[PDB]
Design a protein around this ligand. Structure first.
Ligand SMILES: *Cc1ccc(S(=O)(=O)N2CCc3ccccc32)cc1
Ligand SMILES: *Cc1ccc(S(=O)(=O)N2CCc3ccccc32)cc1
Ligand SMILES: [Cl-]
Ligand SMILES: [Cl-]
Ligand SMILES: [Cl-]
Ligand SMILES: [Cl-]
Ligand SMILES: [Mg+2]
Ligand SMILES: [Mg+2]
Lengths: 227, 9, 227, 9
């Protein structure tokens, strides 16, 4: 994408989303990041939407194949699960590489830095979902460390209803439950997040209230599933 | 369970 | 896919369908066709499902982009619509190339030959949906010719309830309505197909009845939309 | 309108 203007890549990412062409969307956003400039709030959301949808489809396919493989236990199911797994790892490595070169280091405002560290935690979490080898513990710890740094900044710099702070807590709680084998930590985090957001809703406008309550409902949905 | 979606929908 | 066994490609195509990885499915089926052997009924359905789903997604994206472009009337929307269009044309050309080298020429049984000629008509129809240049009339006529040869064989060799004969008539009727600007021909074909199938249902087992009536309902749904 | 689907569903 080196020969395409930044603004054209952003415009085409928006078109790709409307056309449900998420692989294209992600490629356009990778090209935009590689222009080297910081991303605005809207552009950060395009980057996240694109890769979350690409890896989300890979994760769903990996889970279908992993289920078939486990029931089976010729080489074909394992080979094909491995192929999908390698592709998934490649996309996660690409996102992590964009964050490391150089989105995080240039992000000084709390909103941008938390957003990118939340992404970093998420893509290490997706790597941890498929990990089995000598580095699996280190992948889990890399997710934990990114989420923890994001949490520390969010608690110092953002109100408890801020949607990025809430989504971060939601995802870190999923990490605790599904990756770290820490269901109590997951439940505690989701509960305290929900309750502290509830107590700050009175400060919000109607549109901000809608955003915060939407994520609070996701927290509540998980708590209902986990308890 | 569920993580954050990309869009509010 | 040249180094993978035929049977492994077929197995992986089935897995790819279960995982909703239709691009992979199509690649595995292209590799299976390129082994040079004829395809069984089940394998023909894997080939068709794979490419129908890939091109179906490209068509839906092209229609979203074409709508935006028409409302707009910078270069980006047209450029991106053109990119999706070229990809779509490439997939259609690939399918047509498999049919021409050498699926159709080796297909002697009416069921296989009709199936492949129906596919040929469909992929020329998809090319016609995006065509505008000096060859657009020739693309439309190529679709027509393939469908017509399939129809002539089906009427001589298959009962009026045969699901391939019915699906062929359904698709050729869509061709008449949406491509050839022949809505009366489309309605006539759908009506006569439906009525002749109805009169042959008494010969069928329960499972064959289910197949034939499912396609008859598709014919009826189109007739309701068109009248 | 609608053409044939790939699978009976
Ligand atoms: C990680 C994260 C959290 C919130 C947001 S957002 O406020 O831009 N937004 C998009 C996704 C979402 C769901 C519910 C409420 C608000 C939002 C972006 C990223
Ligand atoms: C073109 C075509 C028509 C029918 C068939 S099938 O009989 O194998 N089958 C798969 C799709 C479908 C829909 C409704 C009834 C039967 C079938 C394949 C291809
Ligand atoms: Cl494979
Ligand atoms: Cl900065
Ligand atoms: Cl483009
Ligand atoms: Cl033959
Ligand atoms: Mg420039
Ligand atoms: Mg062999």
């Amino acid at each position: 994408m080196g020969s395409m203007e930044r603004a054209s890549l952003i415009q085409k990412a928006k078109l790709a989303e409307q056309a449900e062409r998420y692989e294209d969307m992600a490629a356009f956003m990778k090209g935009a990041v590689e222009k080297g400039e910081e991303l605005s709030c809207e552009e950060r959301n395009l980057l996240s939407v694109a890769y979350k949808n690409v890896v989300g489809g890979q994760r769903a396919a990996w889970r279908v194949l992993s289920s078939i493989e486990q029931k089976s236990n010729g080489p074909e199911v394992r080979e094909y699960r491995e192929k999908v797994e390698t592709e998934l790892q490649g996309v996660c490595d690409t996102v992590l590489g964009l964050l490391d070169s150089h989105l995080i280091k240039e992000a000084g405002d709390a909103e941008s830095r938390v957003f990118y560290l939340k992404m970093k935690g998420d893509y290490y979490r997706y790597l941890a979902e498929v990990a089995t080898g000598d580095d699996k513990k280190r992948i889990i710890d890399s997710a934990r460390s990114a989420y923890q740094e994001a949490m520390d900044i969010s608690k110092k710099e953002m109100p408890p209803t801020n949607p990025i702070r809430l989504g971060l807590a939601l995802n870190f709680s999923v990490f605790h439950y599904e990756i770290a084998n820490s269901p109590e930590e997951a439940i505690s985090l989701a509960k305290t997040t929900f309750d502290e957001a509830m107590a700050d809703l009175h400060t919000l406008s109607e549109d901000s209230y809608k955003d915060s309550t939407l994520i609070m409902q996701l927290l509540r949905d998980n708590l209902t599933l986990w308890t | 369970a569920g993580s954050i979606p990309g869009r509010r929908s």
